[PDB]
Design a binder for this molecule. Structure first.
Ligand code: DH5
Ligand code: DH5
Ligand code: DH5
Ligand code: DH5
Ligand code: CL
Ligand code: CL
Ligand code: CL
Ligand code: CL
Lengths: 295, 295, 292, 292
């Protein structure tokens, strides 16, 4: 009898690549300017209207995310948690997240991706509304070799996907934000590991492409999709957010704000979250959101 | 007998505020990352479909802008030039630009304002399409005291404008990009100087407001409106553009690109502009635009 | 001999939510945890025996990061400061650690850089009586302990965060002390603000005419990591220097190796688990390259 | 006595369109034109008599900025380099300016910062025979003149932009010369690349055993302003230092005042037209404040 879309954030082991900074704490707990990196994809899923979210991290890191975020109920969310013992590729998320997904639609977001721009809400909404097939976003980059790359024909139809090609067919990278129908778990179960031993998200997306069920929306150049892959790019992302926030006196990817604007929490709930933070600019910001109209 | 909108860039004296950097060359000739500051508002007017543009600068600086930009015909534009002897306020632009405006619609842009974001073309187009009255944009800022400030009532109607108020009524600044009908010159002619001796753009905009002819569109938080008022903010703006451009391998506010995408110049014309620039990344970029599809 | 204290104290809620569930002095400045910077500073002054004082929450996190220090030729101990009751409390908490030895205190969020910094530390630590501090010209002296000089350059007053500062010389977060400091700290009354003040310890030395105040020149960088904006500035400053030089600032393994506290075999062992990133590659490179 | 040359040469089209109709070495690094930095460097080495060599297009722009230098206690002259035919051409163009005196050359886009920089310049300029250069450890030595040292630290080879560099020590864009340099430059054949190379002048001194190569230590900042990305890094580096200290790096008026080339009356006159911004306020402040 009938009378919905779940989220997954993959916040896994960045191995030893960013050591020694990441000896102290996992990558997606490092801040970008003023807030932990995971706040950014979490906020992204929230902006897409997703409230029920599974956070996949290492056994070691699970407790630390849990300590930061809890069960989400203060922000009107239902956050759950699962361990990824080993870094065996991004598609593993769907096998780990299998019982969490159930028979629902899903969205996957990488824990180290930051997005910003105008009408991002509307760009997400058109992905999450398409209730069959899958939807991904293509973004023009300088270094497409580092990503899944999309080739378009002359009428703008997607015709191939390639994982980290040495000779990319275009400058269009697939961003680390994906929307899936109920077929994803069964596609993911049939994947054989790749040459380097990972369950690849590109192979999942190619299965949808081969069935004619993949929507590739362009994420325009007027959106910022930022890179937290290196210490240098983590620093750029910090500068970028700081510049915007200090210009505007508005925050990017403040989860409490997003829950309040989605009406998942009300003004009294937002005031209670502001109380313990009253003595810093972040809690003062939440307080200011109770009385200021922001368009 | 019948069978159009002109642009003005006010690139005037920043006095001695940014000295000694500006002893060598005027403010709007200083670069923001890789291109002279004036490229940014020029590109903004171009994106609005404006081809016929008057550049107002000091007698000293006029020749230097002229040397940089010429008459615009290489980029499919008709740039003209006029001197502002003295820094007597922004509204003077309409008296200086009087014969240039003629009986047409106009757009005014400050030579030190940078804008960026998604569907900026569409945001401009809806201003320039409204062929009577005036249109301005409101942008949430931290420091509204430095700008013209807009007060909205509870239904979102603009009800007051104030120039640099010590006690701002909102955090909404009027950005330095304005669209005017044929009434602007006559409003500007009736302005008495303000307490500090300037012909104020806020007084022009209030005249439209009092006639019920001012449209105030919100420029959303997903747009970046950057500040080149200080050495620090000029540096932020540099970092901001560099981060975006190096992420994307695409340029922000490249005039040649904008003229090519407006179809004001064709592929052969763009190739000829790329030739003298062939030995640097900027000319290599223009060359790459001849063969790459960018969405 | 001289023992060191790093005060990696509580920043309260000021850097929340970055610091929710994540210790301030474990936040990275560019590529390495904040605490590497004061640690390296102490190590550069020749100090191997170091006490890390932090919150009840954060102390075990530093322990789990750094252990007893033996891998870098150090002797690290740990103590907790229950409550942010003033910087001078370090000497009470740290009484039995200091014992009857000379000491140096460094603040956990203070970053230093410059030419002959080794020698500037050397000259302070060699002075075996009195106390030694550094005065650095700053834009906002009101945020710090301020030093007033007379026309002949003698220090004549110290004030903690004065509303009307007598100079632009701030006392940096690096202090050297003789065997008197514990008893000076023990006889302190808390200030109006409710803190055992480090400036109050330093004035006590000044009143005895036993405070050396040396100028840390304008060619040195003393950076603060109090706020999100300063932490960011500091990252960009270090990254700019490191990417230019292909050398690191405040890499403890390098400093221990250069002090001869660890040898080439042990440096090589430290490089192995970091081999697949640039930090281990740098440690490996330091075995074969002559760096003047 | 020692005369100076600033080579503010042609960067071609590489920084276009920023440099279209606007001279490279007049682009600002943070708050001041690029050329203030090498000028100040020369001024810090005690050199008052300075030749600015630039393009036919840019030379009069520097002239119109700086004039004869008399307002800062300097003696500035100007010469043109018709074509970017190598850095060593400075000595041919500058032959009659150098006369029979000692010289120093500095590259117009080179920025230096650090403790006791004054003394490092002092020691090079005091050496009245041979030539003196500085070797600075860098990440990308292939972009520079590279110095090879033997196991005892003696310089044994110099190579201009080697595809396989023998070390990570780059020769900085600051060179001190005796009365031989003009005749060495005059006897140079152009390289395969079509340039009169400064490394070729320096090897000629090395071959005579008259090249001093001193290490510019890792505590000094030597920044390059070749590209848009480096020019930006340099701005952020200087701004971070200046906003922290409330002191300026490479403010020529301050350096002339501190060298006693201009007095307090003249510094005050220079402050007046800049009074309404921070730069003049700083100059005014330097009349009453003691800065160590
Ligand atoms: C429509 C709508 C607007 C907003 C306003 N908003 C926006 N636009 C943003 N952005 C600037 S965003 O859409 O680009 C964005 C949202 C979440 C995470 C990253 C970026 C934000 O960070 N926070 C925020 O409250 C929030 C919720 C909803 Br529903
Ligand atoms: C529709 C359209 C898109 C573009 C693409 N484009 C965009 N979007 C941008 N932007 C990132 S922008 O719309 O925010 C912008 C344009 C001009 C000046 C500043 C920002 C740009 O700088 N250059 C550019 O070619 C150009 C012309 C036209 Br008409
Ligand atoms: C003399 C000496 C030099 C060095 C080299 N060195 C230097 N100079 C530095 N500096 C750039 S520093 O002296 O300004 C510095 C040292 C420790 C912590 C911060 C800065 C460094 O960070 N690491 C380093 O190995 C190490 C130990 C000793 Br003893
Ligand atoms: C000893 C001395 C110190 C000073 C102080 N000083 C210093 N140290 C600096 N430096 C920070 S510097 O020596 O590293 C430097 C000098 C000139 C150009 C670049 C950096 C400066 O920029 N300006 C300045 O007035 C001036 C003249 C003389 Br002689
Ligand atoms: Cl876009
Ligand atoms: Cl928006
Ligand atoms: Cl110094
Ligand atoms: Cl050094």
């Amino acid at each position: 009898h009938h009378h919905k879309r779940k989220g997954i954030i993959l916040a896994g082991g960045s191995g030893t690549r960013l050591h020694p900074a990441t000896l102290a704490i996992s990558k997606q707990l490092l801040p970008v300017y003023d807030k932990p990196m995971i706040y950014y994809p979490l906020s992204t899923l929230m902006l897409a209207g997703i409230r029920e979210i599974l956070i996949i991290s290492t056994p070691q890191d699970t407790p630390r995310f849990q300590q930061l975020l809890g069960d989400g109920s203060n922000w009107g969310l239902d956050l759950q948690y699962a361990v990824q013992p080993s870094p065996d590729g991004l598609a593993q998320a769907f096998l780990i997240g299998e019982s969490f997904i159930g028979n629902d639609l899903s969205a996957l977001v990488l824990g180290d991706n930051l997005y910003y721009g105008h009408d991002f809400h509307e760009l997400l909404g058109s992905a999450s509304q398409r209730q069959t097939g899958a939807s991904v976003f293509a973004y023009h980059v300088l270094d497409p070799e580092r990503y899944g790359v999309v080739e378009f024909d002359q009428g703008g139809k997607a015709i191939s996907l390639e994982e980290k090609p040495l000779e990319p067919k275009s400058n269009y990278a697939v961003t680390g934000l994906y929307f899936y129908d109920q077929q994803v778990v069964d596609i993911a179960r049939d994947l054989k590991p790749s040459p380097r031993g990972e369950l690849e998200i590109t192979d999942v997306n190619r299965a949808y492409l081969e069935r004619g069920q993949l929507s590739v929306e362009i994420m325009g150049r007027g959106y910022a999709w930022l890179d937290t892959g290196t210490h240098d790019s983590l620093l750029e992302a910090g500068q970028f957010i700081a510049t915007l926030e200090n210009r505007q006196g508005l925050k990017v990817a403040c989860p409490e704000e997003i829950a309040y604007r989605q009406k998942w929490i009300d003004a009294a709930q937002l005031e209670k979250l502001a109380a313990p933070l009253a003595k810093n600019g972040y809690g003062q910001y939440l307080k200011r959101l109770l009385t200021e109209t922001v368009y």
